[PDB]
Amino acid sequence: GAMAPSYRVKRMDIAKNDEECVVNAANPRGLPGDGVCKAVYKKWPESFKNSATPVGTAKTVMCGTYPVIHAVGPNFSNYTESEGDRELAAAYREVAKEVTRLGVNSVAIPLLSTGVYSGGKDRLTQSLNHLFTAMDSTDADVVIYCRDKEWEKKISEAIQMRT
Ligand SMILES: Nc1nccc2ccccc12
Numbered sequence: 001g002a003m004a005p006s007y008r009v010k011r012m013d014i015a016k017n018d019e020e021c022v023v024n025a026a027n028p029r030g031l032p033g034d035g036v037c038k039a040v041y042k043k044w045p046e047s048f049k050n051s052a053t054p055v056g057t058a059k060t061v062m063c064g065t066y067p068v069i070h071a072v073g074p075n076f077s078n079y080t081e082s083e084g085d086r087e088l089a090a091a092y093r094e095v096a097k098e099v100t101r102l103g104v105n106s107v108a109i110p111l112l113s114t115g116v117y118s119g120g121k122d123r124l125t126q127s128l129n130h131l132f133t134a135m136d137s138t139d140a141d142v143v144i145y146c147r148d149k150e151w152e153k154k155i156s157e158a159i160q161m162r163t
């Protein structure tokens with residue numbers, strides 16, 4: 001694992017990450033999708049072979065030797081706040097298992113269910129806190145990728161607050 005495991009945030013395309021593996025904000029059917037998922041499909045299309053997996057799970061498919069961890073967050077348009085919150089926590093716990101199994105020293109990760117699956121709500125804090133609950137026990141360097149300038153500041157602050 002990393003010598004001093006850290007969290008960092010960068011405002012850039014996750015398809016251009018500098019980490020040993022990537023988490024996709026996938027859909028359950030392994031379709032090219034939108035946003036993060038479409039950028040991952042363009043960069044690592046080979047990783048979508050048998051990538052379909054249920055809501056609240058993660059499935060890893062290799063693009064050459066580069067791992068892509070397909071994590072399926074809930075679409076809060078379809079789920080109740082209560083059940084959606086449970087599936088969103090579960091998807092991140094499955095990401096932590098896969099990162100540990102792969103023995104990577106670093107992982108690039110988006111905030112699950114904060115885009116078209118947000119059901120029109122700001123879910124920065126909800127999603128980021130479930131990311132921390134899952135990843136805190138792992139020793140990989142975690143690099144969170146976002147698009148919005150205000151989200152970059154809020155994620156950076158939330159990381160710094162824990163020290
Ligand atoms: N700044 C930034 N962050 C994430 C994705 C992007 C895609 C294309 C241009 C800029 C982007």
Ligand SMILES: Nc1nccc2ccccc12
Binds near residue numbers: 012013015145146147
């Ligand atoms: N490509 C990409 N990378 C990071 C964050 C994103 C957010 C929204 C759209 C695309 C993104």
Ligand SMILES: [Cl-]
Binds near residue numbers: 011012013
């Ligand atoms: Cl960019």
Ligand SMILES: [Cl-]
Binds near residue numbers: 112114115116117118
């Ligand atoms: Cl989303």
Ligand SMILES: [Cl-]
Binds near residue numbers: 146
């Ligand atoms: Cl964003």
